[PDB]
C-alpha cells in the first residue's frame, strides 16, 4: 500500500521493529502450532 | 586482598587507554600520537599523571571535602566494582554471582547517582544542567541495554556471567544476534559518554561540565572513571555477545588456547572500536541523541526480545 | 646526597616537559599556523601537547594573533585561572610584541603587557615548525626548573 | 549469597584505593611549584517505568523453558501493554 | 606495512593488563585454596564442601 | 641507542635503510632515505647530542639541504662559506644564562650598557 | 517549546550548477 | 508547504525494493560503515608526520625567516645606510641611524630590526639596493625574553655571516627571479 | 506545472499569470497619482504596460518568461509587488518636481579601467531560452 | 567497497615530488621583465 | 531494590530536592539441593504462568503510570497546548471597533 | 536567559564571543560581540603607502590569504589603470583558486571539527600543508604570502611549481572524495546540518551575504561569473548553487566549489602564457633586482616605489572579488598622494556574522556552533 511504503520509508526503525517483532509474535502464533508433527 | 590484582592492573589499563585512544585516533588521522615521551609514548600516561599530580591547586578549598571530594571517589569505585563479576576466564571471576548481570545493571543505576551528585556539587547552573543531561542520557540508553541484556539472557539460561560466556561454546551471540551487538555497542557508546554520542562531552562543554573545583585529581578521576567505565562496557560487549573467553574452537596446533588472552583480544577489539568510532563520526547533539535512545534503540530492542524469545520458544531452543 | 634531589627534579621536569597541555589562545592566523602545528605533519600530540579548550587544566597558553585592547581583559582573566606551574608562549609578531599593529590604538604592544611570557615564538606567521621549536624551547625552560632543589633552598 | 563477600570487601578496598588516589595529589606540590526542564522529569519517570518492566523481564528471561508457550504469551501481553504505553508516549511526544 | 603496531602497543599493554586482572585473581585464589574457583557453585556444592571437610576429619 | 625516553627512537627506527650523507663539524649526522617512501621524511639529522639537543644546532651549511630548500649537502656548500667573515654556529643559547643569551646595548645586563642621550652633557 | 524543530528530511542530493555549463 | 514537500519527498522513494534499499541502509549503517572503512584504510596507511627536531618541513630559498644583514665577501657590511628598508618596512621595525665612518664611506651606526614589531614580509630584502638585508631561513629563534627578540644595531643581524653559506646559496638561486 | 524556483523562499505560484495581471493593473491604476512629467511615472507606465500586455497575450508562465525576458514569473511578481509598495510609498514624502536652486554637479572621470579588473559584464540577453 | 574505483590510487603520499629541490638551479629561469617591443 | 529505588525513585527525589528546593543440629536434606533454583528462576516459574494476572495488572499499573506522568507533567509543552494559539481571521473584527 | 557562549574550541574560532539569549535549549537571539579581533586595519592603512598596505590584506582573512591581496591589487589597478600581463593574471587566479581550496579545506573541516568529526580536520590540514608548500615556495611565507602586488604579482613562480601543483591536483579529487565520503553520507552529519541555518534568498540578499551563503539559498551569484575580474572569463567552471539553503547545502557547495576550484587550477596550469610577471609600467611595478642595479632610470623607480609609492590618482572605487568567505571588497578612496585614504574593507563575516542572529533563532544551542561553522566566520575580517 502507498501509505505503508510511505511509513516504512519515513520511519524505518518503527517499521522494521514491528516486523523484527512480528517474526517473534508470529513464529509462536502459527509456526509453533504447525509444529505438531 | 586480591582486589589489588584487579584494581591496580585496571588502573594501568585506564592510564594506558588514554594513550591508546590518543594514539589510535591519531593513527586514524594520519599522524603518530604520543611518541616522544616514552619509547613509543609508553611513558606518556605516566607523564600526564605525574604532571596532574604536581600541579598546584587553583584554590585549596579543602573545607568542602565531604560533598564533592568523595563523589568522584564514588563514581570511580562503582566503575571499578562492576569489574568483580566480569569473568576473564573459566573460574577467573572474582565473585561468581548467580545474578551477576542484574548486579551490573544496579551498578549502572548507582553510576547515575555518581554523575548527578558530582554535577550538583558543582555550583554552576550550566555545568549542573549538563551533568543532569548526561545522567538522563546515561539512563535512557540503560533501558535499551537492559532489553539487549534480556535478549542475550533469553538465549542463555541464567544471569551468571560465567554462564553467559559458557553458553556460547556452540556459537557466539555476536553471529546470530549481530544486529543486537550493533545496538549494545551503540548503546554502550551512549551509556558512557565517549561516543559519536557526546554532546555533553563536546570538547569544551565536558571540562566545564563536571565540576568547578578541579585540583587535577577531579579531572584525572573523571577521565580514569570514563576510561574504566569504557573498559568495562567493552568487557560486556565481549562477554555477552562475543565469546567471553572462548576461542573460535578450531583447536590449532600453533595456539595453546589461553582464555584470558582471548578475553583480552576481544576487549581490545571493542576498545579499538570505541576509538575508531570516535574518530570517524560526527556528534549527535543530545537532542537527536535522546530521540535515538527512545525512538530507535528501545523499539529495536523490544522487537529483539520478542524475536529471540519467539524464535526460541517455537523451536524448543531454550 | 644532593643526587636524589637532582633526580627528583629531573623526574618532575620530565613530567612537566612531556605532558604540557596548552590553552591555545588561538586569536587570528597564528591560530591557523598553530592548527598546522597541531595537524598531521608537525604533531603536537606527539610531544604530549594536547590543546585544551579550557583554561582550567592547562600547563601553557600559546597566545597567538593580535591581542586586541578588548581581548586583553579576557586573556588576563584566562591566565589567572591556570594552575600555578603555568607558562605562556607568545606566538606570532602581534602576540609577542607590537607587531604589524604596534601603533594600532586597539592593539596592546605585545601580550607581555597582560601575561608574563616565557617563550616568544618569533616570525609574524611563524612556520609551524617554528611554533614547534618555540614549544621545544618551553620544554627547555621546564628542564631548567629544578623546583625541588629550590624548595630545599 | 556466599559469593557476595568478595564484592562486600571490594567496596571497602576500592574506597581505600580511591582515598589513596585522592591523597596522592594533596601531598605533593608544596610551597614552591532555566526555571525547570520538565522533560528531565518525563525522561526520568519513563526510565523508571521501563526499568520496572525490565525488572519484570528478568525472571521471564531466565525462566522461559519452564513456562512453555504460556509464560511467553503472558509476557507478550504484558509487553503489548508496554508497547501501547510507549506508543502513547511516542505519539504524545515525550521522546524529544 | 606494520606501521599500526606502534598504535597497537598501547592496546597490547592494556590487554596485558586484563590478562593480569584475570590471572592474578585466579592464581591468588588458587593459592589460598588448593583448587581453582568453582563458577557454578550452587548450594549443593557448599553442602558437599561442608560434609567433605567433615569427612576428612 | 639506550634512549627509550625520546622520539630519538623514531629517528633510530629510521636509518635502517637510510644512507648517511656527510656529517658536519658539531657531529650531527645527516641522513637520507629516499626512494622508499614518504616524501618529506627522506632527509633528517641525528644531532650527536642525544640529550640536550634542539633545533637550530644544524649549521647553515646543512640547514639548506635538511629543509629541502636545496640539494647541496653541507660538504658541498662548505666550499662556498666565506673564509674572511665566516662565523661558527651558536646553537641559539636562549635562556641558558646571561652572557650566552643575547642582549641589546642598554639592557643593563650587557657589559658596556651604552647611553643613548643624543645630547652630550657638560 | 513550540520552536520550529530541525526536520532532517529534504529533497535528494542533485548537484545544481548554473546555466553556464556549455554555452554561458 | 514543508508539509507537502515532505509528503512528496517521501512519495519519491515509495516503490518496494527501494523502500527496502533505503530501510537496509538505515537498519544496517551503510554510509557509516563506509566512513569506518575509509577511517581504517587511513589507520593502516603510512603516516604523514614529521619527528620535528630531527627532520623539518620543506622550505624554499624565498622562505622569509630570521633577518640577517649580509656582508660583502671582503668584510665591509653591505648595508650602506640608504634607509630604503626603514622606509618600506610596513611595521617600521628597522630603526637606522647613519654616520660617515672615518674611512669616509657611509655606514649605519644603528641598524636595529625589532623582530617582535616585524611582519616578516620580505619587503626589506626587496627594497635594499645591495641585498644588504635578507631573511635567513633560520625561523628557529624563539627567545626566552622579549628584549633579546629586538635584534640589536648591526651586531646580531651581523650573525648572518654564519647563515651567509645558506643565504648566499638562496640568493644565487633566487636572483634569477 | 513549474516544480520550484531554484531560489529558496520564492515559492512557485501556480496562478502566476492571474496575480501578475492583478498586480500590473493595480500598478497602472496607482501610478496615476504621481505627476505625469516625472521620469518615474514614464518608466512605471511603460514597463508595467509592456509586462501586463505580454502577460495578457501569452497564457503559460513559460511563455510569459520566454517573451518577457525578466527571469521567472515568481521574481516578476516580487518585482511588481515591490513596485506597488514603492508607488504607495512615493505618494508619501512626495519627491516630485525640482526646487529652484537644484545644484546637481554631474562629475565624469573617463579614466579607462584596466580590463582585468572587476567590471560588471552585462550577462546573457533574453535569448537565453 | 568504498571510494576506491581505481581512482583513489592517486594517493596522498607522493614519495617523488619536488624531485628538484627549489634552490638547486638546474635550469636558470629568465622571467622576462618587459615586452621586446618596449 | 538498588535499581528501582536508588537508581530511579530516589533519583526522582534528588531531582525534587535539587530543583524545587523546599526552603550442630541441622539435618540438611540433600534432596531439593540437586537442582538449586536461583531466585529469578523461582519467581519466573510463578509470576508469568500461574499468577500471571497479578502480573498483567501491574502491567496496567505501569501503563497508568506512563499515562499519568504524561497527562500531568507534559506541562503544556506539546500538543496538549502546542497545537496553536488558535486565532482565526474570519472570527476577528480587525480592531476598527475596539 | 542569557548565556555567554564564547569560543568553544579556541584556535579554531578565536575570539567568538556571542551572548546568547536562550530559551531552555532553544536559542531566541544570538548577539555576537565584535572588536576582540578589531586591529586598527582600516586606520593603519591610511598611514602607509599602497605597497606597505598590501600585507594587511593577507592578515585580513587568515584562512584564505591571497584572495584579499587579489582584491586589493584589483583596487589599486582599478585606479592606476595598470594593465597586468596574461601570466600575472593566470598566476593570480591559480593562487586565488588555490586559496579558495585552502579556505574550504579549513572552513569545511574546522566546521566539521566543531560538529564533531575529528579526522576530516587533520586530513584537510595535511592537504593545506601541501598547498602551503606552494605558497611558501612561490613567495616565502606559508600563510601571509605578500605576493599579489598591485601591478601583476611579486615574482615569477619557481621553475618547478607548476609540475608540483599538477602532481597535487591529480591527487586532490581523491582528498575531496574522502572529505565527502566521511561527511556527506553520514546520517550523523546530515542530521547535524540539514535544515540548520536555512536562509531564504530574500534573507541572504537583505543581510548582504554574497558568498557561499548567497548560493546556498539558490541565488546564482558568483562574482567570477557576474564580474569576471581575471582570466575567469576564459576559464571554465560551474558555480554550484544550493536549492534549500540549509547548512547542508552550504557544505555541499563548499565541497563542490573545492572541485571547481580544482578545475580552475588545472586550467590555469595547462594554459599559463610565458609572459612578463609584472606590468611593464615600471612606475607602478618595482623593476627587478638585475635591472635596477644595471639601469640608472630603473634604480630611481626602485627607490621611489619602495619609499614613495605609486601615488595612484584621485578616485574612489569598490573592487570586490569572490574571496572564499564571500564577496570580499575593498572600497579604496584614494587621495592623490602615495598613501591610501580610507581603505575601507568590506569583509564577509561582517555581513555573515550579522546573519547569525536570524540564522540561529530557534535552533538548539549546539547548532550555534554549526552556524558559525558554515558562515566561515574568520574574525580577522570582522
Ligand atoms: C575527551 O577528550 C579528552 C582528550 O582528548 C584527546 C584527552 O586528551 C584526555 C586524556 C588526558 C588525560 C590526562 C586524562 C587523564 C589521564 C591520566 C592523567 C592518566 C592516568 C595515569 C595513571 C593512573 C598513573 C598515575 C600516577 C603515576 C603514573 C605516578 C605514581 C608514581 C610515581 C610518581 C613514581 C614514578 C617513578 C618511577 C621511577 C616509575 C615507577 C581527556 C581526559 C579528554 O577529556
Ligand atoms: C553492514 C554491517 C553494519 C555494522 C555496523 C557496525 C557499527 C558499530 C559501531 C557504531 C557505528 C556508528 C554509530 C552510529 C549511531 C547512530 C545509529 C542510528 O541510530 O542510526 C539509525 C538507526 O540505526 C540503528 O538503529 C542501527 C541498529 C541496527 C539494529 C538492527 C536493525 C534491524 C535488524 C534486522 C534483522 C533482520 C533479521 C531479523 C529477523 C529474521 C537512526 O536513524 P536515522 O535518524 O539515522 O535515519 C532514519 C530516521 N528515521
Ligand atoms: S603576528 Fe602576523 S601571523 Fe601572527 S597573528 Fe599577527 S599578523 Fe597574523
Ligand atoms: S619583513 Fe622587513 S620590511 Fe617587512 S616588517 Fe619585517 S623588517 Fe620591516
Ligand atoms: S639594509 Fe638595504 S635598505 Fe636598509 S640601509 Fe642597508 S642597503 Fe639600505
Amino acid at each position: 500500500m502507498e501509505k505503508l511504503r510511505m511509513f516504512v520509508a519515513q520511519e524505518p526503525v518503527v517499521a522494521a521493529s514491528c516486523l523484527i517483532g512480528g517474526v517473534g509474535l508470529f513464529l509462536p502464533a502459527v509456526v509453533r502450532p504447525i509444529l505438531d508433527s | 586482598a586480591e582486589i589489588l590484582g584487579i584494581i591496580l592492573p585496571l588502573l594501568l589499563g585506564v592510564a594506558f587507554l588514554v594513550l591508546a585512544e590518543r594514539k589510535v585516533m591519531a593513527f586514524v588521522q594520519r599522524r603518530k600520537g604520543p611518541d616522544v615521551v616514552g619509547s613509543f609514548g609508553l611513558l606518556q600516561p605516566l607523564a600526564d599523571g605525574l604532571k596532574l599530580i604536581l600541579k598546584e591547586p587553583i584554590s585549596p578549598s579543602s573545607a568542602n571535602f565531604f560533598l564533592f571530594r568523595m563523589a568522584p571517589v564514588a563514581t570511580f569505585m562503582l566503575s571499578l566494582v562492576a569489574w568483580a563479576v566480569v569473568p576473564f576466564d573459566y573460574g577467573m571471576v572474582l565473585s561468581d554471582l548467580n545474578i551477576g548481570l542484574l548486579y551490573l545493571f544496579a551498578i549502572s543505576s548507582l553510576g547515575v547517582y555518581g554523575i548527578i551528585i558530582a554535577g550538583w556539587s558543582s555550583n554552576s547552573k550550566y555545568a549542573f544542567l549538563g551533568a543532569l543531561r548526561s545522567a538522563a542520557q546515561m539512563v535512557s540508553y540503560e533501558v535499551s541495554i537492559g532489553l539487549i541484556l534480556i535478549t542475550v539472557l533469553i538465549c542463555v539460561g541464567s544471569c551468571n556471567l560465567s554462564e553467559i560466556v559458557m553458553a556460547q561454546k556452540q556459537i557466539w551471540f555476536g553471529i546470530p544476534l549481530f544486529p543486537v551487538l550493533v545496538m549494545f555497542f551503540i548503546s554502550c557508546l551512549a551509556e558512557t559518554n565517549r561516543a559519536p554520542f557526546d554532546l555533553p562531552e563536546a570538547e569544551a562543554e565536558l571540562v566545564a561540565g563536571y565540576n568547578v573545583e578541579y585540583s587535577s585529581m577531579g579531572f584525572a578521576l573523571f577521565f580514569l572513571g570514563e576510561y574504566a567505565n569504557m573498559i568495562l562496557m567493552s568487557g560486556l560487549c565481549t562477554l555477552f555477545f562475543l565469546g567471553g573467553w572462548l576461542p573460535i574452537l578450531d583447536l590449532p596446533i600453533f595456539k595453546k588456547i589461553p582464555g584470558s588472552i582471548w578475553f583480552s583480544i576481544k576487549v581490545l577489539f571493542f576498545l579499538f572500536l570505541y576509538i575508531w568510532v570516535r574518530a570517524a563520526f560526527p556528534r549527535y547533539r543530545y537532542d537527536q541523541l535522546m530521540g535515538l535512545g527512545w525512538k530507535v534503540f528501545l523499539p529495536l530492542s523490544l522487537a529483539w526480545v520478542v524475536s529471540v524469545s519467539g524464535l526460541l520458544v517455537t523451536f524448543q531452543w531454550l | 646526597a644532593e643526587f636524589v634531589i637532582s633526580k627528583v627534579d629531573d623526574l618532575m621536569n620530565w613530567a612537566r616537559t612531556g605532558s604540557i597541555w596548552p590553552m591555545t589562545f588561538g586569536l587570528a592566523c597564528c591560530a591557523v599556523e598553530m592548527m598546522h602545528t597541531g595537524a598531521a605533519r608537525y604533531d603536537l600530540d606527539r610531544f604530549g601537547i594536547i590543546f585544551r579548550p579550557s583554561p582550567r587544566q592547562s600547563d601553557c597558553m600559546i597566545v597567538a594573533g593580535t591581542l586586541t585592547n578588548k581581548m586583553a581583559p579576557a586573556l588576563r582573566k584566562v591566565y589567572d585561572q591556570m594552575p600555578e606551574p603555568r607558562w605562556v608562549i607568545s606566538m606570532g609578531s602581534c602576540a609577542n610584541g607590537g607587531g604589524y599593529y604596534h601603533y594600532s590604538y586597539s592593539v596592546v604592544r605585545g601580550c607581555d603587557r597582560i601575561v608574563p611570557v616565557d617563550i616568544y615564538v618569533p616570525g609574524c606567521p611563524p612556520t609551524a615548525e617554528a611554533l614547534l621549536y618555540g614549544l621545544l624551547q618551553l620544554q627547555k625552560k621546564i628542564n631548567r626548573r629544578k623546583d625541588f632543589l629550590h624548595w630545599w633552598n | 549469597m556466599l559469593e557476595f563477600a568478595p564484592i562486600f570487601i571490594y567496596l571497602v578496598i576500592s574506597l581505600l584505593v580511591s582515598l589513596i588516589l585522592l591523597g596522592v595529589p594533596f601531598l605533593f606540590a608544596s610551597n614552591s611549584s532555566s526555571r525547570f526542564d520538565i522533560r528531565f522529569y518525563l525522561v526520568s519517570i519513563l526510565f523508571l517505568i521501563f526499568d520496572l518492566e525490565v525488572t519484570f523481564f528478568f525472571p521471564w528471561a531466565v525462566s522461559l523453558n519452564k513456562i512453555d508457550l504460556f509464560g511467553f504469551w503472558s509476557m507478550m501481553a504484558f509487553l503489548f501493554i508496554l508497547t501501547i504505553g510507549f506508543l502513547y508516549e511516542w505519539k504524545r511526544g515525550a521522546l524529544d | 606495512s606494520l606501521v599500526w603496531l606502534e598504535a597497537m602497543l598501547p592496546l597490547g599493554i592494556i590487554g596485558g593488563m586484563l590478562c593480569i586482572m584475570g590471572n592474578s585473581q585466579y592464581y591468588i585464589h588458587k593459592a589460598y585454596h588448593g583448587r581453582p574457583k568453582h563458577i557454578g557453585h550452587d548450594e549443593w556444592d557448599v553442602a558437599m564442601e561442608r560434609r567433605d571437610k567433615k569427612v576428612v576429619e | 641507542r639506550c634512549l627509550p625516553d625520546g622520539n630519538l627512537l623514531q629517528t633510530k627506527i629510521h636509518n635502517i635503510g637510510a644512507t648517511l650523507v656527510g656529517v658536519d663539524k658539531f657531529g650531527n649526522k645527516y641522513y637520507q632515505k629516499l626512494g622508499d617512501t614518504q616524501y618529506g621524511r627522506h632527509r633528517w639529522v641525528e644531532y650527536a647530542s642525544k640529550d640536550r639537543y634542539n633545533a637550530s644546532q644544524v649549521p647553515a651549511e646543512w640547514h639548506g639541504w635538511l629543509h629541502f630548500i636545496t640539494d647541496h649537502t653541507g660538504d658541498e656548500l662548505l666550499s662556498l662559506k666565506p673564509k674572511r667573515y665566516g662565523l661558527e654556529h651558536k646553537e641559539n643559547f636562549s635562556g641558558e644564562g646571561d652572557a650566552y643569551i643575547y642582549h641589546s646595548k642598554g639592557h643593563t645586563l650587557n657589559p658596556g650598557q651604552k647611553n643613548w642621550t643624543r645630547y652630550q652633557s657638560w | 517549546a513550540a520552536a520550529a524543530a530541525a526536520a532532517a528530511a529534504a529533497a535528494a542530493a542533485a548537484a545544481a550548477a548554473a546555466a553556464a555549463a556549455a554555452a554561458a | 508547504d514543508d508539509e507537502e514537500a515532505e509528503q512528496l519527498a517521501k512519495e519519491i522513494s515509495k516503490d518496494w525494493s527501494t523502500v527496502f534499499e533505503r530501510s537496509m541502509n538505515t537498519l544496517f549503517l551503510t554510509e557509516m560503515v563506509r566512513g569506518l572503512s575509509l577511517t581504517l584504510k587511513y589507520f593502516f596507511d603510512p603516516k604523514v608526520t614529521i619527528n620535528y627536531p630531527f627532520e623539518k618541513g620543506p622550505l624554499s630559498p624565498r622562505f622569509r625567516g630570521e633577518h640577517a644583514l649580509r656582508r660583502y665577501p671582503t668584510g665591509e657590511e653591505r648595508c650602506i645606510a640608504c634607509k630604503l628598508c626603514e622606509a618600506v618596512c610596513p611595521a617600521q621595525a628597522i630603526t637606522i641611524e647613519a654616520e660617515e665612518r672615518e674611512d669616509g664611506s657611509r655606514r649605519t651606526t644603528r641598524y636595529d630590526i625589532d623582530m617582535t614589531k616585524c611582519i616578516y614580509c620580505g619587503f626589506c630584502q626587496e627594497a635594499c639596493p645591495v641585498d644588504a638585508i635578507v631573511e635567513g631561513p633560520n625561523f628557529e629563534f624563539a627567545t626566552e625574553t622579549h628584549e633579546e627578540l629586538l635584534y640589536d644595531k648591526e651586531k646580531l643581524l651581523e650573525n648572518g655571516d654564519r647563515w651567509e653559506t645558506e643565504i648566499a646559496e638562496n640568493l644565487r638561486s633566487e636572483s634569477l627571479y | 506545472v513549474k516544480q520550484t524556483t531554484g531560489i529558496v523562499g520564492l515559492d512557485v505560484v501556480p496562478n502566476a499569470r492571474a496575480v501578475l495581471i492583478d498586480l500590473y493593473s493595480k500598478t497602472l491604476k496607482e501610478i496615476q497619482a504621481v505627476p505625469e512629467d516625472e521620469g518615474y511615472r514614464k518608466a512605471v507606465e511603460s514597463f508595467t504596460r509592456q509586462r501586463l500586455n505580454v502577460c495578457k497575450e501569452e497564457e503559460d508562465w513559460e511563455m510569459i518568461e520566454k517573451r518577457l525576458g525578466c527571469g521567472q514569473v515568481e521574481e516578476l511578481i516580487e518585482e511588481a509587488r515591490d513596485e506597488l509598495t514603492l508607488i504607495g510609498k512615493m505618494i508619501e514624502w512626495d519627491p516630485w518636481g525640482v526646487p529652484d536652486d537644484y545644484e546637481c554637479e554631474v562629475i565624469e572621470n573617463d579614466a579607462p579601467i584596466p580590463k582585468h579588473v572587476p567590471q560588471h559584464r552585462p550577462g546573457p540577453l533574453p535569448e537565453q531560452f | 567497497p568504498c571510494a576506491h574505483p581505481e581512482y583513489l590510487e592517486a594517493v596522498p603520499k607522493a614519495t617523488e615530488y619536488r624531485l628538484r629541490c627549489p634552490a638547486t638551479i638546474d635550469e636558470e629561469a629568465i622571467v622576462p621583465s618587459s615586452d621586446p617591443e618596449t | 531494590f538498588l535499581v528501582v529505588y536508588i537508581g530511579a525513585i530516589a533519583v526522582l527525589f534528588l531531582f525534587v530536592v535539587m530543583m524545587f528546593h523546599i526552603q550442630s543440629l541441622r539435618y540438611t536434606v540433600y534432596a531439593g539441593k540437586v537442582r538449586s533454583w536461583t531466585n529469578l528462576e523461582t519467581l519466573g516459574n510463578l509470576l508469568y504462568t500461574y499468577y500471571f494476572v497479578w502480573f498483567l495488572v501491574p502491567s496496567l499499573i505501569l501503563l497508568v503510570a506512563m499515562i499519568g506522568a504524561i497527562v500531568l507533567t507534559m506541562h503544556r509543552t506539546t500538543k496538549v497546548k502546542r497545537q496553536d494559539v488558535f486565532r482565526r481571521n474570519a472570527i476577528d473584527f480587525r480592531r476598527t471597533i475596539m | 536567559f542569557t548565556l555567554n557562549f564564547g569560543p568553544q574550541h579556541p584556535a579554531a574560532h578565536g575570539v567568538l564571543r556571542l551572548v546568547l539569549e536562550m530559551n531552555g535549549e532553544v536559542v531566541e537571539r544570538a548577539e555576537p560581540h565584535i572588536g576582540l579581533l578589531h586591529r586598527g586595519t582600516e586606520k593603519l592603512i591610511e598611514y602607509k603607502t599602497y605597497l606597505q598596505a598590501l600585507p594587511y590584506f593577507d592578515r585580513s582573512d587568515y584562512v584564505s590569504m591571497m584572495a584579499q591581496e587579489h582584491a586589493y591589487s584589483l583596487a589599486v589597478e582599478k585606479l592606476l589603470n595598470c594593465e597586468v600581463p596574461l601570466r600575472a593574471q593566470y598566476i593570480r587566479v591559480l593562487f586565488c583558486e588555490i586559496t579558495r581550496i585552502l579556505n574550504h579545506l579549513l572552513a569545511l573541516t574546522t566546521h566539521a571539527m566543531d560538529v564533531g568529526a575529528l579526522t576530516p580536520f587533520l586530513w584537510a590540514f595535511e592537504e593545506r600543508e601541501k598547498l602551503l608548500e606552494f605558497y611558501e615556495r612561490v613567495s616565502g611565507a606559508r600563510m601571509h604570502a605578500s605576493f599579489i602586488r598591485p601591478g601583476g604579482v611579486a615574482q615569477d613562480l619557481p621553475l618547478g611549481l607548476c609540475r608540483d601543483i599538477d602532481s597535487f591536483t591529480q591527487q586532490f579529487a581523491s582528498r575531496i572524495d574522502e572529505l565527502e565520503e566521511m561527511l556527506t553520507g553520514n546520517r550523523i552529519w546530515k542530521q547535524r546540518l540539514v535544515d540548520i541555518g536555512t536562509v531564504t534568498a530574500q534573507q541572504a540578499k537583505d543581510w548582504g551575504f554574497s558568498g557561499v551563503m548567497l548560493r546556498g539559498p539558490g541565488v546564482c551569484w558568483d562574482l567570477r561569473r557576474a564580474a569576471p575580474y581575471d582570466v575567469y572569463d576564459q576559464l571554465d567552471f560551474d558555480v554550484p548553487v544550493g536549492t534549500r539553503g540549509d547548512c547542508y547545502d552550504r557544505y555541499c557547495i563548499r565541497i563542490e566549489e573545492m572541485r571547481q576550484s580544482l578545475r580552475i587550477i588545472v586550467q590555469c596550469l595547462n594554459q599559463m602564457p610565458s609572459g612578463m610577471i609584472k606590468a611593464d609600467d615600471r612606475k607602478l611595478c618595482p623593476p627587478s633586482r638585475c635591472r635596477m642595479k644595471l639601469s640608472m632610470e630603473s634604480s630611481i623607480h626602485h627607490f621611489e616605489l619602495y619609499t614613495e609609492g605609486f601615488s595612484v590618482p584621485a578616485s574612489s572605487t569598490y573592487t570586490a572579488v569572490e574571496a572564499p568567505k564571500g564577496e570580499f571588497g575593498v572600497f579604496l578612496v584614494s587621495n592623490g598622494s602615495n598613501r591610501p585614504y580610507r581603505c575601507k574593507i568590506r569583509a564577509p563575516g561582517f555581513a555573515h556574522l550579522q546573519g547569525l542572529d536570524f540564522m540561529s533563532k530557534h535552533h538548539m544551542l549546539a547548532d550555534v556552533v554549526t552556524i558559525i561553522g558554515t558562515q566561515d566566520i574568520v574574525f580577522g575580517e570582522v
Side-chain angles (χ1 to χ4, degrees), chain L residues 188-194:
Chain L
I188 323 187
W189 187 254
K190 292 175 185 156
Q191 218 151 348
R192 203 93 199 267
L193 257 65
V194 189

PDB file of all heavy atoms in Angstrom, chain L residues 188-194:
ATOM      1  N   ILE L 188      24.761  11.239  10.734  1.00  0.00           N
ATOM      2  CA  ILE L 188      25.043  11.989  11.979  1.00  0.00           C
ATOM      3  C   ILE L 188      25.480  13.325  11.460  1.00  0.00           C
ATOM      4  O   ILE L 188      25.404  14.275  12.219  1.00  0.00           O
ATOM      5  CB  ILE L 188      26.138  11.355  12.830  1.00  0.00           C
ATOM      6  CG1 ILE L 188      26.126   9.831  12.825  1.00  0.00           C
ATOM      7  CG2 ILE L 188      26.054  11.907  14.229  1.00  0.00           C
ATOM      8  CD1 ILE L 188      27.098   9.241  13.807  1.00  0.00           C
ATOM      9  N   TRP L 189      25.917  13.369  10.192  1.00  0.00           N
ATOM     10  CA  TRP L 189      26.208  14.680   9.625  1.00  0.00           C
ATOM     11  C   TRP L 189      24.942  15.363   9.129  1.00  0.00           C
ATOM     12  O   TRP L 189      24.632  16.479   9.557  1.00  0.00           O
ATOM     13  CB  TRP L 189      27.211  14.532   8.491  1.00  0.00           C
ATOM     14  CG  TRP L 189      27.706  15.812   7.932  1.00  0.00           C
ATOM     15  CD1 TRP L 189      27.365  16.367   6.742  1.00  0.00           C
ATOM     16  CD2 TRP L 189      28.657  16.693   8.527  1.00  0.00           C
ATOM     17  NE1 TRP L 189      28.036  17.544   6.560  1.00  0.00           N
ATOM     18  CE2 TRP L 189      28.838  17.766   7.646  1.00  0.00           C
ATOM     19  CE3 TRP L 189      29.367  16.680   9.725  1.00  0.00           C
ATOM     20  CZ2 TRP L 189      29.697  18.812   7.922  1.00  0.00           C
ATOM     21  CZ3 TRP L 189      30.216  17.718   9.994  1.00  0.00           C
ATOM     22  CH2 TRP L 189      30.374  18.771   9.100  1.00  0.00           C
ATOM     23  N   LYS L 190      24.274  14.782   8.144  1.00  0.00           N
ATOM     24  CA  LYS L 190      23.018  15.342   7.629  1.00  0.00           C
ATOM     25  C   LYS L 190      22.210  15.786   8.826  1.00  0.00           C
ATOM     26  O   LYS L 190      21.833  16.929   8.855  1.00  0.00           O
ATOM     27  CB  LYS L 190      22.263  14.289   6.836  1.00  0.00           C
ATOM     28  CG  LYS L 190      22.914  13.862   5.535  1.00  0.00           C
ATOM     29  CD  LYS L 190      22.178  12.727   4.875  1.00  0.00           C
ATOM     30  CE  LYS L 190      22.875  12.206   3.640  1.00  0.00           C
ATOM     31  NZ  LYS L 190      22.489  10.805   3.353  1.00  0.00           N
ATOM     32  N   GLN L 191      22.027  14.943   9.824  1.00  0.00           N
ATOM     33  CA  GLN L 191      21.140  15.287  10.959  1.00  0.00           C
ATOM     34  C   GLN L 191      21.678  16.546  11.619  1.00  0.00           C
ATOM     35  O   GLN L 191      20.878  17.397  11.991  1.00  0.00           O
ATOM     36  CB  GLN L 191      21.038  14.122  11.937  1.00  0.00           C
ATOM     37  CG  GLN L 191      19.650  13.947  12.519  1.00  0.00           C
ATOM     38  CD  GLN L 191      19.376  12.508  12.869  1.00  0.00           C
ATOM     39  OE1 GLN L 191      20.113  11.607  12.484  1.00  0.00           O
ATOM     40  NE2 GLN L 191      18.302  12.279  13.605  1.00  0.00           N
ATOM     41  N   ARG L 192      22.991  16.645  11.745  1.00  0.00           N
ATOM     42  CA  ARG L 192      23.617  17.833  12.365  1.00  0.00           C
ATOM     43  C   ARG L 192      23.583  19.025  11.422  1.00  0.00           C
ATOM     44  O   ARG L 192      23.857  20.113  11.910  1.00  0.00           O
ATOM     45  CB  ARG L 192      25.015  17.502  12.890  1.00  0.00           C
ATOM     46  CG  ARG L 192      25.499  18.429  13.986  1.00  0.00           C
ATOM     47  CD  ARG L 192      25.187  17.895  15.359  1.00  0.00           C
ATOM     48  NE  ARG L 192      25.257  19.025  16.264  1.00  0.00           N
ATOM     49  CZ  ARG L 192      26.340  19.370  16.931  1.00  0.00           C
ATOM     50  NH1 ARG L 192      27.442  18.660  16.802  1.00  0.00           N
ATOM     51  NH2 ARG L 192      26.322  20.416  17.734  1.00  0.00           N
ATOM     52  N   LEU L 193      23.210  18.861  10.145  1.00  0.00           N
ATOM     53  CA  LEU L 193      23.325  20.013   9.259  1.00  0.00           C
ATOM     54  C   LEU L 193      22.065  20.302   8.451  1.00  0.00           C
ATOM     55  O   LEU L 193      21.771  21.466   8.175  1.00  0.00           O
ATOM     56  CB  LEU L 193      24.494  19.829   8.305  1.00  0.00           C
ATOM     57  CG  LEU L 193      25.733  20.631   8.659  1.00  0.00           C
ATOM     58  CD1 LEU L 193      26.293  20.163   9.965  1.00  0.00           C
ATOM     59  CD2 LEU L 193      26.748  20.477   7.570  1.00  0.00           C
ATOM     60  N   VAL L 194      21.324  19.272   8.038  1.00  0.00           N
ATOM     61  CA  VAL L 194      20.130  19.516   7.240  1.00  0.00           C
ATOM     62  C   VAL L 194      19.142  20.364   8.023  1.00  0.00           C
ATOM     63  O   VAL L 194      18.915  20.150   9.217  1.00  0.00           O
ATOM     64  CB  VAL L 194      19.487  18.199   6.789  1.00  0.00           C
ATOM     65  CG1 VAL L 194      18.402  18.473   5.790  1.00  0.00           C
ATOM     66  CG2 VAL L 194      20.514  17.329   6.143  1.00  0.00           C
TER      67      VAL L 194
END
